[PDB]
């Protein structure tokens, strides 16, 4: 008799659902992908759902993965493609057509490739200058940038990390790509060569910032697991073992590699980092169950330490609502999910603020929670979510092989 706040669900996955992606123009279109079983020959499987529809029927199926789907993304700016990335290293590219008569979206397979042996993440490039460009990071530490137009061309392939590449994030202008590794390194790639023409690259010609375990003010023993770039592109934050966060300077493209701040409020891996798009704050989710919030214009002074945000289960993902219905809350509303099987939303306006960081206004500031997934101890936990522009509909993917739809309103 678990509480269940879902307004819809999808139970077509046979095992853990690792990945979710939302169409950038049509938030009702969502793709989910994961594992079909734990037997070592179990294949991967993906679905596309239309959430405008209690038990959802998919409008498309992603087949061809011989191992778990680890990553999914629609391309920016308009979702012309859908890409899936597997534990098998397979990258499958689909053309996406969304008829203007309101009929079902169509998906056509274009090509499969296998540049790496295992894909850890995708990130679409936000540059308006380079549409339909995507980056991925792999288990061999390599980072690949592709452009889709054989629709696939290679923009770059990087081999600087020596251990698994755990996360990547683009700068807002989409000219820089920051990636981190278990081997404790951070590299920020000059993907389209702009920084090099301005004489802003390191001696390896490829990055604007390269920091490794030999850099003593930087090295995070145990590795890095998360990365985020500030809305101005001025700094990158990296999160790692033992609750450590490092703030590093980026060059202005329109100084670099300096450690501007080191943070260690939390006690275990920083798995998720997010800069607020419009408030001077940085949120960090930890494996220890807490979320911490820092004031970016006050040397990252601590604003609030939300202990037990997800009890003592890992905080898996934090993400700011881009355009909440209450415009006064823009930049201050945070959504999080955890291995406790719960999704939560937080009002971050409170805490210890200071000059320039006041709003024009179990832990505090909880606005709402959504239950339905099993908890981690019962084979559940929320592995990811999307929430569109307004945060009014939340779609989750769970370790318990379920996809749930929640509503905020």
Author numbering: 52 to 104, 127 to 222, 228 to 332, 366 to 472, 487 to 534
The authors write:
In the case of Sqt1, we were able to decipher the mode of L10-N peptide binding by X-ray crystallography. These structural analyses showed that the C-terminal domain of Sqt1, which is preceded by a non-essential N-terminal extension of ∼50 amino acids, folds into an eight-bladed WD-repeat β-propeller. Moreover, the binding mode of the N-terminal residues of Rpl10 (L10-N) by the eight-bladed WD-repeat β-propeller of Sqt1, as revealed by X-ray crystallography, allows establishing a refined model for the final pre-60S maturation events that lead to the stable incorporation of Rpl10 and the release of Nmd3. Taken together, we propose that Sqt1 may protect Rpl10 from aggregation before and/or promote its incorporation into almost mature pre-60S subunits in the cytoplasm. We conclude that the β-propeller domains of Sqt1 and Rrb1, which harbour the essential function of these proteins, recognize the very N-terminal residues of Rpl10 and Rpl3.
To this end, we also performed in vitro binding assays with the orthologous proteins from the thermophilic, filamentous ascomycete Chaetomium thermophilum (ct), whose proteins often exhibit improved biochemical properties. Both ctSqt1 and ctSqt1.52C (deletion of amino acids 2–51), which fully complement the absence of Sqt1 in vivo, could be efficiently co-purified with ctRpl10 or its N-terminal 20 residues. As a first step towards the elucidation of the recognition mode of the N-terminal residues of Rpl10 by the predicted β-propeller domain of Sqt1 at the atomic level, we independently determined the crystal structure of ctSqt1 at 1.94 Å by molecular replacement and of ctSqt1.52C, lacking the dispensable N-terminal extension, at 1.5 Å resolution by single-anomalous dispersion (SAD) followed by molecular replacement using the ctSqt1.52C Se-Met structure as the search model. While the N-terminal extension could not be resolved, the crystal structures revealed that residues 52–533 of ctSqt1 form a typical eight-bladed WD-repeat β-propeller; thus, being composed of eight blades that each contain four β-strands and showing the characteristic ‘velcro' closure owing to the presence of the N-terminal β-strand as the outermost β-strand of the eighth blade. Sqt1 and ctSqt1 share a high degree of overall structural conservation and mainly differ in three ctSqt1-specific insertions located in the loops connecting β-strands 1c-1d, 5c-5d and 7c-7d. Analysis of the electrostatic properties revealed that both β-propeller structures notably contain a negatively charged top surface, whereas the bottom sides exhibit a charge-mixed surface.
